[PDB]
Amino acid sequence: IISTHLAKLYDNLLEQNLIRVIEPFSRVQIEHISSLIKLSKADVERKLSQMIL
Amino acid sequence: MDDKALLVEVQLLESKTYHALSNLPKARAALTSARTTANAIYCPPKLQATLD
Amino acid sequence: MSEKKQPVDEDNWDDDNVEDDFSNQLRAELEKHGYKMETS
Amino acid sequence: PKNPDLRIAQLRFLLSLPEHRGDAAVRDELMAAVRDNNMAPYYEALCKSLDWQIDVDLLNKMKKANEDELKRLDEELEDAEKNLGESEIRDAMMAKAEYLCRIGDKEGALTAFRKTYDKTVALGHRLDIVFYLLRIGLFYMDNDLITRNTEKAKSLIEEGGDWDRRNRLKVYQGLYCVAIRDFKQAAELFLDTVSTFTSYELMDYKTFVTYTVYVSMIALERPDLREKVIKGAEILEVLHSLPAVRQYLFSLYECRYSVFFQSLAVVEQEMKKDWLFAPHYRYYVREMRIHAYSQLLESYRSLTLGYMAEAFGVGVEFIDQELSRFIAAGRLHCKIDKVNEIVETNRPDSKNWQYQETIKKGDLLLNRVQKLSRVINM
Amino acid sequence: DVLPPEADSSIMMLTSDQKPDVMYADIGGMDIQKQEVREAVELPLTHFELYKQIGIDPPRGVLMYGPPG
């Protein structure tokens, strides 16, 4: 059983990257955030929704 | 009845299947009872690394 | 203590608040609430 | 004698109140009717379902000759053998009384109860009688004598017992579910699931799990809720046994709202097959929907319904009218727009909300000290 | 004035310097004896409901002995 921990390592790795792209501003559009994170935008909304939830 | 060595086997097999069925405390306890039985075992030649 | 002015003068436990809110809004809650997907 | 008796209470309830549901409940309870010597408490279930059937005088003479054989026993016992308190007379008297609960009606049982209660000097016997009052008081859903004997049990019996009361923890919440107390007392003392054996003191265990999972989503929003329902283990395995319930939990937690309605529809339809679901099937649905909207409208000040039209479910005018009912219900502190298509919420920033509470309670107390002031001083 | 009760008669508590400064997993090799004391001392302190359920009444005290070292 290893893919359980890999998902825990993966969702740890998102929120570590996503807390680094908050400090330059208080207000931003999401497509630059997708461009800085180089991943996607729809998951990023679902992830940021979860971090406020 | 009598046995000691095969008891070490079935405790490990349960502590897998509680961990298979997502049981933290009881598998921890079944492992701990597996250890203290295995401590008086004269020979864990192979079962040791299984238990480890 | 009467005050000389009298002209004239169970089923639930307490359910007025839900019924003042929702009295008749299709309480089966399946046939439109679960069946929007055929409509869209 | 009162061991398979909660199931009977469902089959009476399942057959009586819905008329369309009358196919198999008449098939299995009729077998339960002709067995168990249930000869008092079936007249309504015979007058509300079918016309009549002759097996009646056959069972009447058997219960009478048995009762008379039981009547001739304990009178000879109290005429030959002189021991009182808790003796051979006593376990005759409860065996009459349990014969009264299983076979006869409640009235002969409760007068045999109050008769044999005054012939008790121990505490376990007095605990046993109050176990019997509460068991039959739930069977006939009597909300009168439960108000007494529970207070009688907790104050006068349960100061010497030790872990004999988890059963009466479970019976209290069971009354709270058929009452309106389905909010925070119901989930709090359902939190300890450390009994699985099913007995006179303990009902069906899977059904106990389904009740304690359905009620533990109303008490508490997410104040590390997930520690008690997900990080638990003994609750987790039995919901790991049940695919429907486990799907319902992860849909609510991980915010899978699309399947969430489908899980909610299965529950409410299954909720009809219950004997205590009456203050639920008009309350539990809308409370979860307004809880689902509460956490979704959280973290979005300028949410649009154009994202609700595919991520949440389908439809547009249905979500609009349901939000328009819920705002006008008085809850969900948000505003909806139509022609900008922006569900723009207004959450108070923890200073208005403190101020809104303090201005209500101060007005409610100033009323209370006015109304007190006018009663006094003539 | 009245002084608070037991403001005297010894000062023998261990809070905040000084500390034992060793983790529990530092001792390698006592699979029973570490497990035995922990059942007798630490386990009554937190999981008190388990003892009361069976009626074990956890033990008052513990004698340790043997050769030095």
Side-chain angles (χ1 to χ4, degrees):
Chain A
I1 301 167
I2 46 98
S3 177
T4 301
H5 296 88
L6 292 171
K8 301 299 180 290
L9 188 139
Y10 182 70
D11 298 332
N12 195 4
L13 187 57
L14 265 72
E15 64 186 2
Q16 288 304 112
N17 291 319
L18 288 171
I19 54 96
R20 295 180 184 178
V21 290
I22 304 301
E23 292 86 8
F25 49 81
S26 67
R27 176 180 62 191
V28 84
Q29 58 269 14
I30 58 162
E31 68 277 14
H32 284 79
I33 302 301
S34 69
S35 299
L36 263 67
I37 209 66
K38 197 174 64 67
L39 188 63
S40 176
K41 64 176 72 174
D43 50 354
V44 174
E45 292 179 352
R46 294 184 289 111
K47 182 68 174 174
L48 264 67
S49 66
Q50 186 178 4
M51 297 302 106
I52 301 171
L53 281 168
Chain B
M1 289 288 168
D2 187 68
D3 195 83
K4 188 66 69 176
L6 186 57
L7 272 73
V8 181
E9 194 273 339
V10 297
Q11 293 299 107
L12 264 69
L13 192 55
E14 289 186 355
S15 181
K16 293 173 77 69
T17 194
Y18 287 114
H19 182 75
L21 299 178
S22 179
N23 202 352
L24 195 275
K26 188 180 264 80
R28 172 59 57 83
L31 184 64
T32 304
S33 66
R35 297 292 298 273
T36 183
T37 303
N39 199 2
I41 290 296
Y42 63 112
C43 284
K46 177 253 181 63
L47 295 175
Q48 183 64 38
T50 311
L51 175 141
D52 294 333
Chain C
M1 184 62 205
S2 178
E3 291 295 334
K4 295 295 290 182
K5 186 173 74 68
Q6 47 176 356
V8 175
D9 297 331
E10 177 67 28
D11 292 332
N12 294 118
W13 182 75
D14 183 73
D15 207 0
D16 197 5
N17 196 6
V18 179
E19 192 272 338
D20 278 328
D21 201 5
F22 285 172
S23 296
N24 45 359
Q25 297 192 1
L26 62 152
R27 78 281 296 147
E29 297 290 324
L30 179 60
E31 291 83 3
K32 187 176 186 295
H33 299 89
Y35 292 157
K36 289 188 288 181
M37 294 176 180
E38 61 183 0
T39 63
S40 298
Chain D
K2 299 174 72 66
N3 305 318
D5 206 4
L6 282 76
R7 179 170 177 83
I8 298 170
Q10 185 179 5
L11 266 60
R12 298 295 177 89
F13 187 80
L14 184 63
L15 184 144
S16 178
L17 278 78
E19 296 294 327
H20 61 87
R21 184 65 181 172
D23 47 359
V26 71
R27 285 194 289 272
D28 55 358
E29 181 68 30
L30 185 62
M31 193 68 206
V34 299
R35 293 177 296 169
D36 205 11
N37 210 167
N38 297 325
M39 283 305 294
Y42 79 104
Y43 291 162
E44 293 84 2
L46 187 53
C47 287
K48 273 78 176 178
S49 174
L50 296 177
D51 196 1
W52 287 102
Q53 194 271 329
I54 176 170
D55 281 328
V56 181
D57 294 333
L58 280 74
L59 291 176
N60 284 316
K61 64 184 180 66
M62 294 177 71
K63 66 174 282 183
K64 181 65 181 296
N66 196 5
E67 175 68 26
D68 291 329
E69 194 271 330
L70 288 175
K71 184 261 292 180
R72 68 183 295 276
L73 177 59
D74 56 352
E75 63 88 20
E76 179 68 32
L77 178 56
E78 69 188 0
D79 289 331
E81 199 271 334
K82 302 300 188 294
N83 282 318
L84 273 304
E86 296 87 0
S87 71
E88 192 178 6
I89 278 93
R90 177 68 178 91
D91 57 356
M93 288 300 293
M94 65 182 78
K96 300 300 291 293
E98 287 288 324
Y99 184 79
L100 287 168
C101 288
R102 183 181 181 172
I103 285 90
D105 282 327
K106 63 177 179 294
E107 290 88 6
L110 54 85
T111 183
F113 281 165
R114 294 179 175 89
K115 182 172 176 63
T116 199
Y117 180 76
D118 294 333
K119 199 167 70 64
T120 54
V121 303
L123 59 95
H125 295 276
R126 295 181 184 175
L127 184 65
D128 284 331
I129 298 299
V130 179
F131 281 180
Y132 292 155
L133 266 65
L134 287 175
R135 192 174 300 119
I136 195 166
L138 183 61
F139 287 154
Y140 292 159
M141 64 182 287
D142 293 329
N143 293 318
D144 295 330
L145 297 175
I146 53 93
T147 59
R148 299 176 68 187
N149 53 8
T150 57
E151 182 182 1
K152 264 59 181 293
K154 291 172 68 66
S155 62
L156 298 173
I157 299 167
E158 296 177 356
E159 67 270 11
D162 200 5
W163 299 98
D164 46 351
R165 83 280 306 281
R166 286 188 66 245
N167 303 317
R168 293 297 169 269
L169 258 62
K170 290 190 181 182
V171 171
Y172 289 171
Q173 314 292 94
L175 267 70
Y176 290 170
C177 292
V178 78
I180 203 68
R181 301 298 297 274
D182 194 75
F183 181 73
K184 66 180 182 296
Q185 290 301 108
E188 182 68 30
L189 283 304
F190 270 169
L191 201 280
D192 44 350
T193 62
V194 209
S195 288
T196 63
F197 183 73
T198 65
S199 185
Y200 63 93
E201 61 182 357
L202 292 170
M203 61 179 290
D204 195 8
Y205 174 68
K206 182 183 76 176
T207 64
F208 177 72
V209 170
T210 57
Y211 291 163
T212 185
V213 67
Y214 289 158
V215 77
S216 60
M217 55 185 58
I218 301 175
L220 70 163
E221 184 183 2
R222 301 287 182 90
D224 204 359
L225 169 140
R226 68 263 182 100
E227 196 271 334
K228 294 181 292 297
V229 303
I230 302 169
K231 300 295 184 182
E234 69 276 13
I235 187 65
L236 185 59
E237 294 183 352
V238 289
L239 68 92
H240 182 80
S241 176
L242 297 175
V245 179
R246 184 176 65 81
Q247 185 179 3
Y248 179 70
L249 290 174
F250 295 162
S251 304
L252 181 64
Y253 184 73
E254 196 173 356
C255 294
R256 294 185 182 91
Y257 292 104
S258 303
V259 73
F260 180 79
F261 281 159
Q262 292 302 107
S263 62
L264 191 144
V266 167
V267 167
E268 165 61 28
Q269 186 63 43
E270 186 67 30
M271 185 64 73
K272 300 289 176 70
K273 294 177 71 66
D274 186 72
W275 66 91
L276 54 93
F277 77 106
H280 293 278
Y281 67 97
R282 294 177 180 177
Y283 184 71
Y284 184 75
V285 176
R286 51 173 296 167
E287 184 66 31
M288 289 304 297
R289 288 177 176 174
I290 202 160
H291 182 75
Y293 291 169
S294 65
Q295 63 182 358
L296 181 141
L297 267 299
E298 195 272 337
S299 175
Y300 293 99
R301 72 101 181 264
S302 176
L303 185 140
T304 185
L305 46 89
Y307 186 66
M308 297 300 108
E310 70 273 12
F312 184 72
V314 289
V316 168
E317 69 272 11
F318 179 74
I319 289 97
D320 182 77
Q321 70 179 3
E322 187 177 2
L323 291 174
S324 183
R325 290 178 295 177
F326 284 168
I327 297 169
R331 295 181 183 272
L332 289 182
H333 193 195
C334 71
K335 295 294 289 183
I336 191 164
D337 189 348
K338 175 61 70 179
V339 287
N340 290 118
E341 198 187 5
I342 293 173
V343 181
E344 175 61 32
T345 184
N346 48 2
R347 190 180 296 275
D349 54 352
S350 177
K351 292 293 182 180
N352 293 318
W353 182 254
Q354 290 291 322
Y355 178 68
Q356 292 300 322
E357 289 171 351
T358 53
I359 196 63
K360 297 295 183 183
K361 301 298 190 292
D363 289 336
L364 189 143
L365 194 146
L366 186 140
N367 190 4
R368 186 66 178 170
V369 300
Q370 281 176 355
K371 177 179 67 175
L372 181 54
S373 172
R374 297 187 179 99
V375 174
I376 56 92
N377 198 358
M378 192 65 199
Chain E
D1 195 1
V2 181
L3 275 303
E6 288 89 6
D8 212 358
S9 301
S10 62
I11 296 95
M12 292 306 296
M13 297 76 162
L14 285 174
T15 54
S16 76
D17 296 332
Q18 64 277 23
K19 292 297 182 187
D21 196 6
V22 59
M23 73 280 198
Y24 183 79
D26 202 5
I27 301 165
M30 299 312 173
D31 291 332
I32 296 172
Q33 297 165 355
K34 291 172 71 174
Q35 193 267 339
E36 187 67 32
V37 180
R38 189 178 179 181
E39 283 180 353
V41 173
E42 182 177 0
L43 188 65
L45 193 278
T46 64
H47 298 287
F48 185 62
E49 297 174 350
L50 291 170
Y51 289 155
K52 297 291 286 186
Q53 180 179 4
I54 303 169
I56 302 172
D57 295 335
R60 182 65 65 191
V62 42
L63 193 274
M64 304 189 291
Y65 64 100

